[PDB]
């Protein structure tokens, strides 16, 4: 009845797991108790050590080609893979083992999707995104650092209801959540259109909610649901609270210059 | 075998491996040896992940650092951002405005509450609570237990407990146990009656739903949770009480924050603190006072929450260092002093020129060196038994003046208690909480449940896994109370006409000295956090983090001295050496964050 989810953790900060449990519609409680069977998840699971590891074999056998593999974080290729050790073995071995019989694979967040902060220059561990390691399975990327809670649960809900991965863009992201740039529906857009910008923090323009483009806002080049769905049950989003988007859902955003350096070619947008 | 810090380490007994350690943040391996009677006589803490944030930061703009280091951890989300902006501000001689100070304090205290409460219910509780036992509880008796434990909590009727029990039952009867699969249920290490188990499980579910509300405070001030935005020089959430709706912060947003704070205060007072007091009492009655480790001797915190900004003498969680269990003498701790905080790598997977010394973090070095000792069982990529005589962790070994210290809420509460005894009036509330808690645990809760009264002192009760768990709950309550006052002060300051949120005088790097160094400290949820930065020609020259779980989860130093995790596990009986119930209960009492510990 309830589809198993094996939720693996590589090199990560656990922010994607945290975002997940903030979901209001649906409640994470209802997802765990009534929608999925969350059978492996280091953050919440009762079993440890040998007892935890033994669950993976059991679910993979009983639900072969009928469980979802969810991945938070990524595998390092340097240090012989032992900059991320699980059961005395490299994480990449667990990832490959669990991936082989999964119905579908979810790359949660920017780390799993693209590399994340650990893959920013000079990438000491050679952290590598999931889709560059697992090349023979269907993968949905749900980028963002972390993704919006309702986007994460929205993906799960679609997959459970329809037993399909939703339509993806060229980069493997769900169009139902990543089709718009932040700048498209950002409530500060009328200020941008009128050339009304913040130039220094807490200037008169900032107190009037003027556009954050000149303070480095990467909304014009960033695809996410932040300006519409917003964060923590539609409470706010980075721009509403006064900081420009830093581009956190985009591939390699950490190495696209200072967060406070403005985009060039304002005519473009 | 050898003796250190009063502990007699012996690795001749039966070896037990726990990998992965679950219900923590990140990746840890733990190994112990047990004697002929299943008592732990050796313990080995291995951080099993590394990302290299310190290396990644080199050459970047100090103003961008907070966002990188924030991603050290999404559990203690924002505490690294706070340490970073403080460190940059310290380096550049930047004083933030009063409203920025108060908003940061409110965000910090919100994190404390959220992190503490989620930890206890969703990570820690299954070490104390048997979920399968809850299925056998009488709903009526559970209702009666609830009324005794916390009279003011409105969700107490038998029908409500029956409803929760049935959903649990149906869930279990489905055959898909999810997070409860292969648990250690029915172990004699569990001592709670069914009614207490059902009460606790019910609160586990309540807290899962409620935790998402508390973080909306972060969302208002910082745009999002996890990973709210910070700013060198202040906060980005500009204020316009009155075109009010166009500014990030107006009166309606502040009223919303206050509503969330009031809810937090209710939860801590009615659900969290009473549950911990009740569970603690029952495990105390069972005689389970193990896990004290270094808390019995050596504790440290930098000190935090000055009621007057930039004046550490007014810290509401006053810090310092205690040695040798002498609570009559608190040594001052200076994060700038090269002879105080130092990190060794003798038993860590890093290299120094000379590994017989510890480096202060302004002189810190992070060069990986993954190599396993000669007595390892298994191979480089398939470890069966780690060799703790050599390098065995991605965690560095921080020490204070060479001493191994425990950090965290318990450390802060012991320090606060010591400070209060010495005449520090800023520590009176934590002292009151501790004395109240001792009386509840020793007398009031036993009387109410028909158990014999005990006479444990705070000095006996606090250095224990129970005590460590208690201090976390009390700290959560205190942080909720403090941010309630911070809110009033913020609103009052704005109404007096001060709307300033950022000092931008030194935002442009053309205004900076060509070199500088700074340090930022934070009383993070898990203990003492510091970021040390060196700036050169507008760029990061060095950036070193020493994080709370780096202290607590430390492997051994050059002298072979053990860290808090390893000491806490020592001399603990296991009911069944193949079920890590006691290892997990004690490790989890530190709230390990392994991504933090290694960064
Ligand atoms: S994407 Fe961001 S938030 Fe998620 S698990 Fe990576 S660093 Fe943390
Ligand atoms: S630049 Fe940023 S703040 Fe300005 S309208 Fe576009 S997304 Fe909004
Ligand atoms: S920083 Fe990230 S959370 Fe949204 S507003 Fe920009 S994509
Ligand atoms: Cl990335
Ligand atoms: Cl670019
Ligand atoms: Cl501050
Ligand atoms: Mg460090």
CA distance B83 to A179: 36
Do residues B362 and B339 make contact, with C-beta atoms less than 8 angstroms apart? no
Question: Residue B380: exposed, middle, or buried by beta-carbon count in 10 A (0-12, 13-18, 19+)?
Answer: middle
**3-state SS track over B475-506:** HHHHHHHHHHHHHHHHHHHHHCCCCCCECCCC
Question: Residue B186: exposed, middle, or buried by beta-carbon count in 10 A (0-12, 13-18, 19+)?
Answer: exposed
b/e sequence B273-291, b meaning 16+ C-beta within 10 Å: bbbbbbbbbbbbbeebbbb
Tokens at B396, concatenated: 């560095």
Upstream peptide bond of B226 is cis (omega within 30 degrees of 0):
yes
Could you count the other beta carbons within 10 Å of the beta carbon of residue A100? Answer: 14
Q: Is B425 on the interface with A (CB under 8 A)?
A: no
Give residue B546 CA to ligand 7 midpoint distance, Å.
5
Comparing C-alpha atoms, which of A200, A238, A202, A245 is closest to residue A220? A245
Comparing C-alpha atoms, which of A88, A112, A43 is closest to residue B594? A43
Q: Indicate if A139 and A249 belong to the same structural domain.
A: no
Give bridge partners of residue B16 from the DSSP assignment: B32
Q: Indicate if A160 and A66 belong to the same structural domain.
A: yes
Comparing C-alpha atoms, which of A34, A70, A64, A49 is closest to residue B183? A49
DSSP secondary structure string, A62-84?
HTTT-SEEEEESB-B-SGGGTTB
Coil, helix or strand for B368?
strand
Q: Indicate if A225 and A117 belong to the same structural domain.
A: no
Upstream peptide bond of A31 is cis (omega within 30 degrees of 0):
no
Comparing C-alpha atoms, which of A218, A231, A219 is closest to residue A146? A231
CA distance B486 to B505: 26
Q: Indicate if A108 and A208 belong to the same structural domain.
A: no
Q: Indicate if A165 and A235 belong to the same structural domain.
A: no
Q: Indicate if A105 and A28 belong to the same structural domain.
A: yes
Pairing label, strands B539-546, B527-536:
antiparallel
CA distances in angstroms from B89 to A8, A257, A258, B436, listed in the order given = 38, 22, 18, 39
What residues of B are designated binding site for Ni(2+)? Answer: 73, 76, 593, 596
Do residues B131 and B198 make contact, with C-beta atoms less than 8 angstroms apart? no
CB contact under 8 A, A124 and B55: yes
Q: Which CATH number fits the domain that encloses residue A196? A: 4.10.480.10
Could you count the other beta carbons within 10 Å of the beta carbon of residue B488? Answer: 12
Helix (H) or strand (E) holding A21: helix A15-21
Q: Indicate if A15 and A143 belong to the same structural domain.
A: yes
Spatial CB neighbours of A62, under 8 Å, sequence gap ≥ 6: none
Tokens at B434, concatenated: 């501790």
Asked whether residue A211 is marked as a ligand-binding residue, the answer is yes
Pairing label, strands B28-34, A36-41:
unpaired
> Which domains occur in chain B, in start order?
2-339+402-598 (1.10.645.10)
Spatial CB neighbours of A109, under 8 Å, sequence gap ≥ 6: A12, A15, A16, A72, A73, A116, A142, A143, A144, A145, A146, A147
DSSP secondary structure string, A205-258?
HHHTT-B-GGGT--GGG-BSSTTTT-BTTTTB-TTTTT-----TTSTTGGGSS-
Do residues B527 and B408 make contact, with C-beta atoms less than 8 angstroms apart? yes
Q: What sign does the CA torsion over B466, B472, B473, B477 have?
A: positive
DSSP secondary structure string, B238-263?
-B-----TTSSB-HHHHHHHHHHHHH
Q: Indicate if A44 and A25 belong to the same structural domain.
A: yes
Tokens at B491, concatenated: 């609103």
Instruction: Using the structure block, give the residue that is written with the tokens 């989620």.
Output: B118
Residue where a domain terminates, one of A177, A208, A229: A177
Supply φ then ψ for residue B418, to 5 degrees: -60, -45
b/e sequence A222-246, b meaning 16+ C-beta within 10 Å: bbbbbbebbbbbebbbbbbbbbbbb
H and E: helices and strands count for chain A? 10, 7
Residues composing chain B:
599
Asked whether residue A84 is marked as a ligand-binding residue, the answer is no
Q: What sign does the CA torsion over B570, B574, B578, B579 have?
A: negative
Do residues B296 and B325 make contact, with C-beta atoms less than 8 angstroms apart? yes
Ramachandran assignment for B305, one of left (phi > 0), alpha (psi -120 to 50 degrees), beta (any other): left
Rg (CA), chain B: 24
CA distance B253 to A161: 37
CA distances in angstroms from B569 to A252, B14, B30, B187, listed in the order given = 42, 15, 10, 19
DSSP secondary structure string, B281-324?
HHHHHTT-----GGGGT-EEE--EEESSTT-GGGEEE--EEE-T
Supply φ then ψ for residue B267, to 5 degrees: -65, -45
Residue where a domain terminates, one of A131, A161, A177: A177
Coil, helix or strand for A140?
strand
Taking chain B, what is the end-to-end CA distance rounded to the nearest angstrom?
A: 32
Domain residues for the domain of A216 are 180-269
CA distance B405 to B554: 10
Residues after which chain A is broken (C–N above 2.5 A) are none
Instruction: Say how far residue A27 (Cα) sits from the centre of its chain.
Output: 18
CA distance B219 to A233: 10
Give residue B332 CA to ligand 6 midpoint distance, Å.
21
Q: Indicate if A164 and A188 belong to the same structural domain.
A: no
Domain count, chain A: 2
CA distance B201 to B207: 10
Angle at B276 between CA B270 and CA B282, to 5 degrees: 125
Supply φ then ψ for residue A174, to 5 degrees: -70, 120
Instruction: Say how far residue A18 (Cα) sits from the centre of its chain.
Output: 11
Spatial CB neighbours of B583, under 8 Å, sequence gap ≥ 6: B18, B30, B32, B40, B569, B572, B574
Tokens at B219, concatenated: 């969302």
Supply φ then ψ for residue B359, to 5 degrees: -105, 130
CA distance A233 to A123: 34
Do residues B593 and B25 make contact, with C-beta atoms less than 8 angstroms apart? yes
Instruction: Say how far residue A62 (Cα) sits from the centre of its chain.
Output: 29
Rg (CA), chain A: 20
Q: Resolution reached, in Å?
A: 1.6
Restricting to B residues 332-371, those with a Cβ less than 8 Å away from any Cβ of A are 349, 368, 370
Q: Indicate if A173 and A184 belong to the same structural domain.
A: no
Environment of ion ligand 6 (residues, CB < 5 A): B 104
Ligand 3 atom at minimal distance to the Cα of residue A226: 4
CA distance B199 to A207: 48
Do residues B347 and B391 make contact, with C-beta atoms less than 8 angstroms apart? yes
Could you count the other beta carbons within 10 Å of the beta carbon of residue B403? Answer: 18
Do residues A92 and A133 make contact, with C-beta atoms less than 8 angstroms apart? yes
CA distance A13 to B78: 12
Coil, helix or strand for B154?
coil
Task: Point out the residue among A22, A43, A117 whose CB comes nearest to the CB of B212.
Answer: A22
Pairing label, strands A104-108, A68-72:
parallel
Q: Which residue in chain B has the smallest CA separation from A37?
A: B178
Give residue B530 CA to ligand 7 midpoint distance, Å.
9
Q: Which CATH number fits the domain that encloses residue A27? A: 3.40.50.700
Coil, helix or strand for B369?
coil
CA distances in angstroms from A249 to A109, A117, A141, listed in the order given = 8, 12, 10
CA distance B323 to B215: 37
Spatial CB neighbours of A15, under 8 Å, sequence gap ≥ 6: A109, A145, A146, B71, B73, B74, B75, B77, B226, B227
Q: Indicate if A252 and A213 belong to the same structural domain.
A: yes
Spatial CB neighbours of B549, under 8 Å, sequence gap ≥ 6: B395, B526, B527, B590, B592, B593, B594, B596, B597
Tokens at B52, concatenated: 């290299």
Do residues A134 and A168 make contact, with C-beta atoms less than 8 angstroms apart? no
Q: Indicate if A194 and A63 belong to the same structural domain.
A: no
Determine whether the shortest distance from the Cβ of A31 to ligand 2 is under 6 A. no
Do residues B99 and B235 make contact, with C-beta atoms less than 8 angstroms apart? yes
CA distance B301 to B321: 7
Comparing C-alpha atoms, which of B323, B304, B291 is closest to residue B399? B323
Asked whether residue A217 is marked as a ligand-binding residue, the answer is yes
Instruction: Using the structure block, give the residue that is written with the tokens 């409105």.
Output: B154
Residues composing chain A:
269
Comparing C-alpha atoms, which of A146, A81, A138 is closest to residue A116? A146
Supply φ then ψ for residue B391, to 5 degrees: -90, 130
Question: Residue B120: exposed, middle, or buried by beta-carbon count in 10 A (0-12, 13-18, 19+)?
Answer: buried
Q: Which residue in chain B has the smallest CA separation from A260?
A: B64
Q: Which of A6, A26, A46, A160 is the mutation pick for testing B, counting most B CBs within 10 A?
A: A46
Instruction: Say how far residue A224 (Cα) sits from the centre of its chain.
Output: 10
Do residues A228 and A185 make contact, with C-beta atoms less than 8 angstroms apart? yes
Give bridge partners of residue B271 from the DSSP assignment: none
Residue where a domain terminates, one of A162, A177, A192: A177
């Amino acid at each position: 009845p309830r589809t198993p989810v094996l939720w693996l953790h590589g090199l990560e900060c656990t922010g994607c797991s945290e975002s997940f449990i903030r979901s209001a519609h649906p409640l994470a409680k209802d997802v765990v108790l009534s929608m999925i069977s969350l059978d492996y998840d280091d953050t919440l699971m009762a079993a440890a050590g040998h007892q935890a590891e033994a669950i993976l074999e059991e679910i993979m056998t009983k639900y072969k080609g009928n469980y979802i593999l969810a991945v938070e974080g990524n595998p390092p290729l340097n240090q012989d893979g032992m900059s991320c050790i699980i059961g005395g073995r490299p994480f990449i071995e667990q990832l490959k083992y669990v991936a082989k019989d999964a119905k579908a694979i979810i790359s949660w967040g920017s780390c799993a999707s693209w590399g994340g902060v650990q893959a920013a220059k000079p990438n000491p561990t050679q952290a590598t995104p999931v889709h560059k390691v697992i090349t023979d399975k269907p993968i949905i990327k749900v980028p963002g650092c972390p993704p919006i809670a309702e986007v994460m649960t929205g993906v799960i809900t679609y997959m459970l209801t329809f037993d399909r991965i939703p339509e993806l863009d060229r980069q493997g992201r769900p169009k139902m959540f990543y089709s718009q740039r932040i700048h498209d529906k950002c409530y500060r857009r009328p200020h941008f259109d009128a050339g009304q910008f913040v130039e220094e923090w807490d200037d008169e323009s900032a107190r009037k909610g003027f556009c954050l483009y000149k303070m480095g806002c990467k909304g014009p080049t960033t695809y996410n649901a932040c300006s519409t769905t917003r964060w923590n049950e539609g409470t706010s989003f980075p721009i509403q609270s006064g900081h420009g988007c830093i581009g956190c859902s985009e591939d390699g955003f950490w190495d696209k210059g200072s967060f406070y350096d403005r985009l060039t070619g304002i005519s473009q947008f | 075998a050898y003796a250190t810090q009063g502990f007699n380490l012996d690795d001749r007994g039966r070896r037990i491996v726990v990998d992965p350690v679950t219900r923590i943040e990140g990746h840890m391996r733990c190994e112990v040896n047990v004697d002929a009677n299943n008592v732990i006589r050796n313990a080995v803490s291995t951080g099993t992940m590394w990302r290299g944030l310190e290396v990644i930061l080199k050459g970047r703009d100090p103003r961008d650092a907070w966002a990188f280091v924030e991603r050290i951890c999404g559990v203690c989300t924002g505490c690294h951002a706070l340490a970073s902006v403080r460190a940059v501000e310290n380096a550049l001689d930047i004083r933030i405005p009063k409203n920025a100070h108060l908003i940061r304090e409110i965000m910090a205290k919100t994190l404390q509450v959220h992190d503490h409460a989620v930890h206890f219910y969703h990570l820690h509780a299954l070490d104390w609570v048997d979920v399968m036992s809850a299925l056998k509880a009488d709903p009526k008796r559970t209702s009666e237990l609830q009324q005794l434990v916390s009279p003011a909590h409105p969700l107490s009727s038998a029908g409500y407990f029956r409803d929760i029990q049935n959903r649990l039952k149906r869930f279990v009867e489905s055959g898909q146990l999810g997070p409860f699969m292969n648990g250690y249920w029915g172990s004699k290490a569990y001592v709670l009656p069914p009614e207490a188990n059902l009460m606790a499980v019910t609160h586990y579910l309540e807290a899962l739903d409620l935790q998402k509300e508390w973080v909306k405070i972060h969302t208002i001030f910082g745009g999002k949770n996890p990973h709210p935005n910070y700013l060198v020089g202040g906060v980005p959430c500009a204020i316009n009480l009155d075109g009010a709706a166009s500014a990030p912060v107006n009166m309606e947003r502040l009223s919303f924050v206050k509503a969330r704070i009031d809810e937090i205060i209710e939860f801590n007072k009615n659900v969290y603190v009473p549950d911990v007091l009740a569970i603690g009492t029952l495990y105390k009655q069972a005689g389970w006072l193990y896990g004290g480790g270094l808390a019995a001797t050596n504790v440290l915190d930098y000190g935090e929450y000055p009621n007057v900004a930039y004046n550490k003498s007014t810290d509401q969680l006053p810090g310092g260092a205690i040695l040798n269990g002498n609570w009559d003498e608190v040594f001052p701790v200076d994060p700038r002093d090269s002879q105080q905080v130092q990190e060794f790598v003798s038993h860590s997977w890093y290299k120094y020129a000379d590994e017989s010394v510890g480096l202060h973090p302004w002189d810190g070095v992070t060069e990986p060196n993954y190599v396993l000792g000669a007595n390892t069982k298994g191979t480089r990529t398939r470890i069966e038994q780690i060799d703790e005589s050599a390098k065995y962790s991605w965690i560095k070994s921080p020490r204070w003046r060479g001493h191994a210290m425990e950090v965290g809420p318990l450390s802060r509460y012991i320090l606060a208690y010591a400070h209060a005894r010495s005449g520090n009036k800023y520590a009176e509330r934590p002292k009151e909480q501790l004395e109240y808690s001792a009386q509840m645990i020793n007398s009031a809760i036993p009387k109410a449940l028909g158990l014999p009264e005990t006479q444990y002192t705070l000095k006996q009760l606090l250095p224990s896994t129970i005590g460590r768990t208690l201090a976390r709950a009390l700290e959560s309550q205190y942080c909720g109370e403090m941010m309630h006052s911070d809110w009033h002060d913020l609103v009052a300051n704005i109404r007096a006409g001060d709307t300033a949120t950022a000092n931008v005088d030194k935002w442009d790097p053309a205004t900076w000295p060509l070199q500088a160094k700074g340090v930022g400290t934070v009383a993070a949820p898990r203990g003492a956090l510091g970021h040390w930065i060196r700036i050169k020609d507008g760029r990061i020259e060095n950036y070193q983090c020493v994080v709370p779980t780096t202290w607590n989860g430390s492997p051994r130093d050059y002298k072979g001295q053990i860290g808090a995790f390893e000491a806490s596990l020592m001399n603990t009986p296991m009911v069944n050496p193949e079920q890590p119930v006691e290892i997990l209960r004690t490790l989890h009492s530190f709230d390990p964050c392994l991504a933090c510990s290694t960064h």
